[PDB]
Amino acid sequence: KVGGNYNYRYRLFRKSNLKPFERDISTEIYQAGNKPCNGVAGVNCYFPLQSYGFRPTYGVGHQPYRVVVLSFELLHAPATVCGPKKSTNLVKNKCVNF
Amino acid sequence: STIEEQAKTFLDKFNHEAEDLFYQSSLASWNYNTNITEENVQNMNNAGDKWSAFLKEQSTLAQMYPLQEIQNLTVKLQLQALQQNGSSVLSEDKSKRLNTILNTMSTIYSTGKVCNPDNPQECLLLEPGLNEIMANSLDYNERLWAWESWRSEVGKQLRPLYEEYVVLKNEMARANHYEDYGDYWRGDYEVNGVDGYDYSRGQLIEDVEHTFEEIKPLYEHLHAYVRAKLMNAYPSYISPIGCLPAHLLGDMWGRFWTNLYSLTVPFGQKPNIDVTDAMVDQAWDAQRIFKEAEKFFVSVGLPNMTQGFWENSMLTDPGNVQKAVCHPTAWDLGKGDFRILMCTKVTMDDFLTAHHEMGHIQYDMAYAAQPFLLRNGANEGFHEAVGEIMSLSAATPKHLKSIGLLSPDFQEDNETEINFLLKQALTIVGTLPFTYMLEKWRWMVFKGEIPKDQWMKKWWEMKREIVGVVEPVPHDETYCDPASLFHVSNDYSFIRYYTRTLYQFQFQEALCQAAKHEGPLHKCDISNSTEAGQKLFNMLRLGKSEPWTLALENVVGAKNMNVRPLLNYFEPLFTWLKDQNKNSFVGWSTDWSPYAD
Ligand SMILES: *[C@@H]1O[C@H](CO)[C@@H](O[C@@H]2O[C@H](CO)[C@@H](O)[C@H](O)[C@H]2NC(C)=O)[C@H](O)[C@H]1NC(C)=O
Ligand SMILES: *[C@@H]1O[C@H](CO)[C@@H](O[C@@H]2O[C@H](CO)[C@@H](O)[C@H](O)[C@H]2NC(C)=O)[C@H](O)[C@H]1NC(C)=O
Ligand SMILES: *[C@@H]1O[C@H](CO)[C@@H](O[C@@H]2O[C@H](CO)[C@@H](O)[C@H](O)[C@H]2NC(C)=O)[C@H](O)[C@H]1NC(C)=O
Ligand SMILES: *[C@@H]1O[C@H](CO)[C@@H](O[C@@H]2O[C@H](CO)[C@@H](O)[C@H](O)[C@H]2NC(C)=O)[C@H](O)[C@H]1NC(C)=O
Ligand SMILES: *[C@@H]1O[C@H](CO)[C@@H](O[C@@H]2O[C@H](CO)[C@@H](O)[C@H](O)[C@H]2NC(C)=O)[C@H](O)[C@H]1NC(C)=O
Ligand SMILES: *[C@@H]1O[C@H](CO)[C@@H](O)[C@H](O)[C@H]1NC(C)=O
């Protein structure tokens, strides 16, 4: 939207690297220095969300790009979701392999 | 938890918020510059003030990290660029006084009025009329009246203000450990802690004085030639062994000699190459020009335009009512948004200005991956040099005859060669002594070597000894002649116009050898060669991340600025001049004056 779309909120501060397929929605204040800040902004304590400033007059590489990540898992189930097959036709009165 | 790791944590947040706010401010400024209304002014001032306030708050916040415990060079560069107090280190009364006298000086220079002696209700400003009389008139008395009145009725109001501005700026500069306001200016070319590329703030003076010591043999011959030609338009006013009166030079100050071309043209019956009839013959418009410029740029190995450049840019003057300040500039709004604002007509000057602006656009596209505080040229003299080598190499006949603007054969002769070289010399070489002398005067004024009762005397002594011009009327110590120049009363540096002229030809000769040129240097064309593009891109993409003495070596092979390429460029004109002054007297004597009679 012209004027800024401030609803997309990638996080840029965390104490450790994420593990594979984890999610962190906490909103505690990041402690950079050595003096605790007790949950308020100020010096060496920041808000860990940095919402994108989307606008239409940007350059490719700064415009929004939706993403979908399909991921498959086959642990032990014998008959599961599967792809589609082209149902053949049934013939009659001929020696056939069926 | 150390003092270094917190610097990066602070720099990340600063980078992001700064990018956002700077984009907002630049968009407001553009929307004002392309569409002048009344509410756009306030909508621009709001965003500008918000950005300035954010910058000031981040600056006063950044003072917690000592620049001594930092180990990274990029972090140290960013912090040192952010930690600088600048102004506001003074008291409040002094800051208000400084801003008031700055605005008063700018206003006095902008709307100064002079009028006739016999018809006092005929007052002319500077821009519409004074630098037109001084540019087109061929009358001695009229030029003298204009040159004297502009300095007697405007320069005399700027002296009591300059005498206070000097002290205020000296105090502001000594509050930041700089010993004067001149060192604060020369601090841009400083480089520390690289072990092989150091550069003190005091070596710039010696470098400038040693590079100007080798341009004198050429400027002397150019001066003698222009004098022997001016002794025919104003007879009995110029002496064959004296200097030139300062009002017969082409403009109000003598900065560019380019208006003396109609008088001092070598061969006046051979028209210099000017493809303007062919453009209107093939019906070129405001868009084909930029298409051709982009094609020339992509020929050497640089990327296309970002495709957001074509819809948002203003390449033509809007018609009905869209009053727009179209002074050709290239914008860098950020976040991948580049635009160009210019009123293009169908001429040759616009055909070269398009290349000049797209040079800046390509430079801006180069270093767009650096942090926010490191997106600029290596110093104040790289941007315009890069933007100028393009228009230099794009106006040759060999390049013009492949686009289609010239006849297919068009044999070239040496007379038009000398015409073009001399028209180039009156603008390139005619300003280096003036710039050097003015900046030397300002450095000596700020340093405290010229007491405030010897300003005009020393100014005219140096103008007689270095530039080689003399004043037509004695100027006592009530006048202030330098203060009548735009860059002196509006507080802008002036040493960039000297180093740019050297960097330009250094780059041109460095690129002429990768493209494997054969003939003289002024016939170079870098197009259709991917080596020149690679060498230039190895420097364009650095920004301020590296010291400039290293970004320069990555192109030319040396560290310090040199003057040999300029002389190699002007060699043919030099030999021709050295054979046209067999009978004249090369040099000048500082005793003859037009009034001592
Ligand atoms: C130039 O600016 C003026 C005012 O800033 C614009 O005039 C009006 O702007 C409002 C803003 O939403 C529009 O709703 C109106 O339709 C505009 N009036 C007219 C007569 O167009 C003007 O549109 C701006 N010009 C351009 C080219 O953007
Ligand atoms: C601190 O210094 C190191 C090296 O001295 C920098 O590491 C470079 O990081 C950039 C991008 O982060 C890489 O492209 C380079 O290849 C790295 N160089 C080396 C030698 O590893 C680091 O970037 C510096 N810190 C900051 C904030 O810039
Ligand atoms: C920049 O200005 C400040 C004053 O606004 C200078 O004074 C220091 O400011 C810091 C920040 O609070 C204090 O901790 C110091 O005690 C102040 N005095 C000092 C350091 O002597 C500061 O020195 C200035 N720095 C620069 C680089 O100009
Ligand atoms: C341009 O080149 C021509 C020859 O290519 C020059 O003409 C010769 O100039 C020399 C030196 O004055 C004379 O000795 C010859 O007699 C000339 N030859 C002819 C056929 O005229 C000409 O002088 C050059 N012009 C410039 C400005 O350099
Ligand atoms: C750069 O090189 C290209 C290709 O080598 C040149 O394009 C050809 O130039 C010749 C010369 O007249 C023409 O006959 C061809 O029709 C051109 N081909 C195309 C596809 O346009 C181009 O002229 C060169 N440019 C410069 C400035 O030297
Ligand atoms: C630039 O754009 C033109 C289309 O106008 C295309 O033909 C060419 O391949 C592009 N070159 C690059 C380097 O993107």
Side-chain angles (χ1 to χ4, degrees):
Chain A
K1 300 154 40 199
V2 47
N5 197 52
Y6 291 91
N7 299 279
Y8 300 111
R9 304 254 294 285
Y10 82 103
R11 148 194 306 231
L12 84 166
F13 289 132
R14 206 180 176 279
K15 293 220 312 170
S16 157
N17 278 186
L18 261 184
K19 273 184 163 46
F21 278 144
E22 278 188 19
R23 191 167 159 189
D24 213 18
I25 194 156
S26 307
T27 312
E28 301 277 290
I29 279 304
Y30 182 36
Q31 160 192 331
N34 212 340
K35 287 190 264 284
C37 31
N38 300 129
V40 203
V43 304
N44 285 344
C45 285
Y46 312 89
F47 203 38
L49 304 193
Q50 191 32 52
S51 73
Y52 296 111
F54 284 146
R55 291 161 215 275
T57 46
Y58 271 7
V60 189
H62 284 253
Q63 288 177 5
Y65 274 61
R66 305 198 167 173
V67 169
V68 193
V69 175
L70 311 161
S71 157
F72 315 131
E73 281 297 5
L74 202 165
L75 172 63
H76 72 311
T80 89
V81 61
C82 280
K85 267 337 129 312
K86 319 307 125 230
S87 84
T88 87
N89 299 359
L90 79 105
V91 306
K92 294 181 206 60
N93 311 107
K94 317 219 298 293
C95 174
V96 86
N97 211 143
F98 61 84
Chain B
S1 86
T2 166
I3 323 94
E4 175 194 2
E5 297 182 279
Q6 318 172 21
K8 281 147 45 56
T9 296
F10 167 55
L11 253 331
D12 294 5
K13 191 215 60 179
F14 169 72
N15 284 322
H16 294 170
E17 288 178 59
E19 296 203 0
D20 190 4
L21 273 160
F22 182 65
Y23 182 90
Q24 279 178 19
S25 176
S26 268
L27 179 58
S29 191
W30 162 275
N31 256 333
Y32 164 71
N33 260 84
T34 206
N35 176 16
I36 290 192
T37 323
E38 190 39 45
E39 62 109 342
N40 268 175
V41 181
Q42 66 183 355
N43 200 28
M44 148 172 167
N45 282 317
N46 283 0
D49 274 348
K50 204 139 59 63
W51 158 251
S52 181
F54 165 80
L55 200 58
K56 204 78 203 151
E57 191 52 19
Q58 295 293 332
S59 156
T60 178
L61 214 162
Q63 304 288 340
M64 186 46 231
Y65 319 113
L67 221 79
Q68 184 263 290
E69 260 291 356
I70 313 298
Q71 302 296 127
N72 224 313
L73 273 297
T74 308
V75 175
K76 178 131 67 179
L77 280 173
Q78 293 181 75
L79 277 189
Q80 146 204 317
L82 195 59
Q83 279 188 359
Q84 69 173 12
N85 271 296
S87 179
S88 88
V89 69
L90 307 160
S91 297
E92 293 284 61
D93 324 298
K94 295 212 192 43
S95 168
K96 200 192 316 306
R97 191 41 175 154
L98 179 59
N99 276 88
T100 317
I101 73 186
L102 265 178
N103 280 334
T104 303
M105 271 208 286
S106 155
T107 280
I108 277 181
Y109 172 87
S110 165
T111 87
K113 243 178 247 71
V114 319
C115 9
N116 234 64
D118 44 2
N119 183 251
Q121 29 252 27
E122 186 252 321
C123 310
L124 322 90
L125 312 151
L126 173 57
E127 186 280 338
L130 272 198
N131 57 25
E132 170 264 297
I133 278 187
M134 292 294 295
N136 312 345
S137 202
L138 265 186
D139 208 331
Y140 184 93
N141 307 133
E142 199 178 23
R143 298 182 65 101
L144 174 54
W145 162 77
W147 180 95
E148 220 305 307
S149 123
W150 170 251
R151 279 159 171 75
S152 146
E153 311 222 322
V154 169
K156 291 228 279 214
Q157 309 183 56
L158 285 154
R159 167 106 184 200
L161 298 188
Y162 208 84
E163 260 184 17
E164 191 72 342
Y165 154 102
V166 158
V167 179
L168 278 199
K169 285 270 173 177
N170 245 17
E171 179 42 53
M172 170 258 262
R174 250 184 313 271
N176 306 353
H177 328 95
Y178 270 159
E179 318 163 340
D180 59 36
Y181 193 43
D183 198 354
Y184 175 93
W185 266 344
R186 307 193 304 268
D188 193 339
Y189 293 76
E190 190 188 17
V191 164
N192 284 107
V194 194
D195 188 350
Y197 302 90
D198 272 328
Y199 209 78
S200 318
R201 304 181 316 258
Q203 197 161 314
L204 176 62
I205 308 179
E206 268 184 48
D207 272 18
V208 162
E209 265 157 41
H210 271 192
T211 67
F212 182 77
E213 194 156 290
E214 287 172 318
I215 317 194
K216 265 156 62 177
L218 170 67
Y219 179 67
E220 278 183 3
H221 285 287
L222 184 71
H223 184 254
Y225 179 74
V226 171
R227 183 175 67 212
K229 247 53 177 42
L230 272 185
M231 266 182 64
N232 296 342
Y234 322 111
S236 88
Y237 284 130
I238 315 266
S239 203
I241 73 172
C243 324
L244 314 156
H247 56 286
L248 307 181
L249 287 195
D251 58 5
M252 186 75 57
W253 307 279
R255 195 184 163 202
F256 298 120
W257 292 9
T258 184
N259 285 134
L260 298 192
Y261 185 65
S262 41
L263 299 172
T264 81
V265 66
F267 306 101
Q269 55 274 66
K270 323 297 278 302
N272 39 359
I273 296 164
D274 171 77
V275 299
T276 305
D277 194 13
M279 303 183 69
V280 186
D281 191 341
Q282 293 180 3
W284 280 34
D285 56 25
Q287 204 206 319
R288 182 91 173 278
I289 291 173
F290 282 91
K291 282 296 182 172
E292 285 293 341
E294 181 204 0
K295 180 144 49 189
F296 157 67
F297 265 110
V298 64
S299 153
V300 317
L302 302 187
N304 262 338
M305 285 288 101
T306 175
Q307 147 74 8
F309 168 84
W310 294 113
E311 320 97 321
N312 308 131
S313 304
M314 207 189 81
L315 310 173
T316 328
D317 196 338
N320 50 0
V321 273
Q322 277 206 36
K323 303 151 302 284
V325 176
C326 46
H327 172 56
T329 45
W331 290 74
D332 192 38
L333 289 90
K335 302 236 171 187
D337 194 2
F338 317 98
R339 309 184 189 189
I340 277 188
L341 163 93
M342 65 180 308
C343 280
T344 57
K345 308 150 201 323
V346 183
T347 78
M348 197 177 171
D349 282 18
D350 304 1
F351 177 76
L352 299 188
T353 301
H355 291 62
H356 177 89
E357 301 308 309
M358 291 205 52
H360 291 161
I361 281 297
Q362 286 284 343
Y363 204 169
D364 280 321
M365 283 176 41
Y367 56 61
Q370 297 289 336
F372 170 74
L373 285 171
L374 303 195
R375 292 181 196 164
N376 269 117
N379 53 52
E380 15 136 273
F382 269 43
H383 225 80
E384 279 291 325
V386 166
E388 261 293 347
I389 61 177
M390 309 316 195
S391 101
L392 211 55
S393 162
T396 80
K398 191 184 65 171
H399 172 74
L400 275 187
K401 91 176 312 179
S402 92
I403 294 180
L405 304 190
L406 277 185
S407 315
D409 41 57
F410 191 63
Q411 299 100 318
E412 305 145 1
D413 36 355
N414 46 351
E415 300 185 348
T416 301
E417 182 149 339
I418 300 291
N419 273 239
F420 170 67
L421 264 192
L422 184 120
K423 186 179 185 165
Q424 281 280 104
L426 292 185
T427 302
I428 301 300
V429 186
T431 177
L432 294 194
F434 174 79
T435 287
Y436 161 72
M437 178 260 173
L438 174 129
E439 197 60 23
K440 190 183 193 176
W441 185 76
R442 266 212 299 207
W443 289 349
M444 277 170 73
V445 152
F446 282 125
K447 189 165 174 289
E449 271 158 20
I450 299 187
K452 70 162 47 192
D453 60 72
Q454 288 186 175
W455 280 8
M456 276 312 107
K457 188 178 104 68
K458 281 293 297 172
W459 169 257
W460 281 118
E461 269 195 7
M462 277 160 44
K463 252 221 170 191
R464 285 190 199 197
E465 200 288 328
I466 290 180
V467 190
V469 305
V470 71
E471 80 281 9
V473 157
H475 274 333
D476 67 41
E477 281 264 5
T478 304
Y479 297 69
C480 197
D481 294 338
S484 90
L485 186 46
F486 176 81
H487 300 254
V488 177
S489 63
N490 291 59
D491 192 330
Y492 287 118
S493 197
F494 217 81
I495 207 57
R496 63 165 70 101
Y497 299 94
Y498 183 86
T499 43
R500 150 184 92 84
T501 314
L502 269 46
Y503 291 151
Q504 162 180 4
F505 293 107
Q506 268 206 289
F507 291 154
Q508 177 80 339
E509 171 151 332
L511 300 192
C512 98
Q513 228 290 318
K516 303 192 197 61
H517 199 48
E518 281 263 21
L521 196 77
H522 66 287
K523 286 178 171 176
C524 199
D525 190 332
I526 55 171
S527 67
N528 263 332
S529 66
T530 49
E531 264 89 331
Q534 192 53 43
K535 280 190 80 67
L536 189 67
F537 192 80
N538 252 353
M539 182 264 298
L540 289 193
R541 71 165 191 80
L542 279 174
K544 291 173 63 58
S545 156
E546 281 315 272
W548 69 268
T549 76
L550 177 84
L552 185 63
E553 166 171 299
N554 272 4
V555 181
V556 306
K559 307 185 191 65
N560 31 59
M561 64 178 168
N562 228 15
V563 85
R564 288 301 305 162
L566 193 137
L567 308 189
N568 262 125
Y569 180 89
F570 278 104
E571 248 291 330
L573 181 82
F574 189 32
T575 288
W576 183 70
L577 285 179
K578 213 210 299 296
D579 206 68
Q580 270 268 306
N581 291 165
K582 279 187 317 170
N583 297 135
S584 193
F585 172 69
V586 278
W588 56 78
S589 76
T590 80
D591 285 26
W592 177 91
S593 32
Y595 50 82
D597 267 344

